[PDB]
Amino acid sequence: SMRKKIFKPEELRQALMPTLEALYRQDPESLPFRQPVDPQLLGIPDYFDIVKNPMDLSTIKRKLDTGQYQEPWQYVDDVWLMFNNAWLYNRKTSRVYKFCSKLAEVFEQEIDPVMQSLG
Ligand SMILES: CO[C@H]1CC[C@@H](n2c([C@@H]3CCCC(=O)N3c3cccc(C(C)(C)C)c3)nc3cc(-c4c(C)noc4C)ccc32)CC1
C-alpha cells in the first residue's frame, strides 16, 4: 500500500515484545544472542570485517522499548539480521549456528499471527 498504517509505540511493544520473549525463553539456544557479540572477549578479530551490521536480542529489546520501530516489518528485519549474521559468520556444525536455526523456527511460528493481528 501507499498509505503507511500508523502504529503507536505501546501498540508495537504489546504486540511484538511477546515474540521477542519467546526467543529469550529458548535455553540454551538464546544464550549466545542475549548480548552483543564481543570480538575482543571472544578472540575473533575478523568478526566486524565479516558482519557489517551487528544485531542481538538486547539491542532489539532496547529499540522496542525506545520506540525506534515505526512499523512491525522494521522489527522483523532486525530479528532476521541477527539470524543472518549468525548463519554468515558461524560454521554450520557450531552450537551458535544450530541455535540460530532453532530461534528462526520459533520466531517464524510466533510472528505470523502477530503480523495478521497488526494488519
Ligand atoms: C552469557 O554471556 C556469554 C558471553 C559470550 C558467550 N559466547 C560464546 C562462549 C564463549 C566461550 C567459549 C564458548 O564455547 N562459548 C559458547 C559457544 C556457544 C554456546 C555457549 C553456551 C554455553 C552459552 C550455550 C557458549 N561464544 C559465543 C559466540 C557468539 C556469536 C558469534 C561468534 N557469532 O555470532 C554469535 C551469536 C556470541 C556469544 C558467545 C555466550 C554467553
Author numbering: -2 to -1, 1081 to 1197
What does the primary publication say about this deposited structure?
These proteins contain several highly homologous domains, including KIX, bromodomains (BRDs) and HAT domains, through which they interact with, dock to, and acetylate target proteins, respectively. Using crystallography, we identify the binding mechanism of the EP300/CBP-specific BRD inhibitor CCS1477 in complex with the EP300, CBP and BRD4 BRDs, and define components of the CCS1477 catalytic binding core that are required for compound activity.
Since recombinant CBP BRD was more robust in biochemical assays and crystallization studies, Kd values were determined for all compound-CBP interactions by MST, and co-crystal structures of the CBP BRD with five of the seven analogues were determined. While none of the analogues were superior to CCS1477 in terms of binding affinity, substitutions were well tolerated if productive interactions with R1173 were maintained.
